[PDB]
Amino acid sequence: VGRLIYTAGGYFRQSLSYLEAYNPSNGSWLRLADLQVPRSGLAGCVVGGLLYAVGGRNNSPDGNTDSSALDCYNPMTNQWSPCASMSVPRNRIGVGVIDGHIYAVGGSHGCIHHSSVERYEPERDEWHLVAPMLTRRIGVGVAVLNRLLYAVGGFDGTNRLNSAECYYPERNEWRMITPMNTIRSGAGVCVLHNCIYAAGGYDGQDQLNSVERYDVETETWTFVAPMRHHRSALGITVHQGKIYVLGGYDGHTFLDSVECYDPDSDTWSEVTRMTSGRSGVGVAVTMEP
Ligand SMILES: O=S(=O)(Nc1cccc(-n2ncc(-c3nn[nH]n3)c2C2CC2)c1)c1ccccc1
């Protein structure tokens, strides 16, 4: 009990510093301490009950600055603290956690599209590079299942991608997996039960509402019910056996919609609205502050 869905940063007109937390048990939102630097295109994750904001870009009137930053929010104090920075700025990043370590995957720095990957050790406050992906990927969806790290879709600088790959830590090696049925860049990717879900994204022409899942045993991708709203640059997380998608861009509006997927019924429902529409947030779940 006592866990909230935290949304950090995002974009509406400019990059945002908001940190807000939604309580599924009572529908409430809390506004918490702002990020030190506004950022969109970041990712969130949690290790040891602390929330981390990783990478992104500050789109502002004074300029556009890609972020190498790692910042840590402690719900007990409602304070952000800087951590060691990554080796390189990474906007439109994906992150995943394996055994207490944060993997930062891909992303962009100006016109550079990264294949590089680095791993953070909270106990030592150090980053180190690991093997790079087989493909350069920005807007990459990342998730961890059974202590394996998946990188899904994205944009390589020329093509939006349906391809996906998996990192096997004990071999420090990436291998391609079955490609998705749909090209998706800037999708939401998460794990639920024994599958990697990819929701929404942009296929080069349209924002998507379709959702597909990769069963890691059978190596197949299967479509599930589509979301009510097409969305790119959505936030995504899992909480108590359901997927939550937050915001994004539908080609017309920066959405405030939050939808929730129930895998038992294979249905999506609208569960709340963010306090304002935005895209490009980072999202994770930890204890209330
Ligand atoms: O400020 S945003 O939130 N930035 C952002 C954040 C997270 C991921 C991505 N992302 N990553 C690769 C691509 C991409 N692939 N092919 N074309 N585009 C994108 C874009 C399409 C969503 C972008 C922002 C979003 C939508 C409209 C205006 C601003």
Swiss-Prot record:
S-cGMP-cysteine PTM sites in chain numbering: C111
Family: Belongs to the KEAP1 family.
Outcome, altering R92M: Impaired interaction with NFE2L2/NRF2
Transmembrane parts of this sequence: none
Subcellular location as annotated: Cytoplasm; Nucleus
Self-association state and partner proteins as the record states: Component of the BCR(KEAP1) E3 ubiquitin ligase complex, at least composed of 2 molecules of CUL3, 2 molecules of KEAP1, and RBX1. Interacts with NFE2L2/NRF2; the interaction is direct. Forms a ternary complex with NFE2L2/NRF2 and PGAM5. Interacts with (phosphorylated) SQSTM1/p62; the interaction is direct and inactivates the BCR(KEAP1) complex by sequestering it in inclusion bodies, promoting its degradation. Interacts with NFE2L1. Interacts with BPTF and PTMA. Interacts with MAP1LC3B. Interacts indirectly with ENC1. Interacts with SESN1 and SESN2. Interacts with HSP90AA1 and HSP90AB1.
Effect of S232A: Impaired interaction with SQSTM1/p62
Post-translational modification summary for this protein: Non-enzymatic covalent modifications of reactive cysteines by electrophile metabolites inactivate the BCR(KEAP1) complex. Accumulation of fumarate promotes the formation of cysteine S-succination (S-(2-succinyl)cysteine), leading to inactivate the BCR(KEAP1) complex and promote NFE2L2/NRF2 nuclear accumulation and activation. Nitric oxide-dependent 8-Nitro-cGMP formation promotes cysteine guanylation (S-cGMP-cysteine), leading to NFE2L2/NRF2 nuclear accumulation and activation.
Effect upon mutating R160A: Does not affect interaction with SQSTM1/p62. Abolished interaction with SQSTM1/p62
Renumbered ranges of Kelch repeats: 4-49, 50-100, 101-147, 148-194, 196-241, 242-288
Annotated site, Sensor for electrophilic agents, chain positions: C111
Outcome after substituting Q207A: Impaired interaction with SQSTM1/p62
Name this polypeptide is given: Kelch-like ECH-associated protein 1
Residues forming coiled coils: none
Domain of life: Eukaryota
Role, per record: Substrate-specific adapter of a BCR (BTB-CUL3-RBX1) E3 ubiquitin ligase complex that regulates the response to oxidative stress by targeting NFE2L2/NRF2 for ubiquitination. KEAP1 acts as a key sensor of oxidative and electrophilic stress: in normal conditions, the BCR(KEAP1) complex mediates ubiquitination and degradation of NFE2L2/NRF2, a transcription factor regulating expression of many cytoprotective genes.
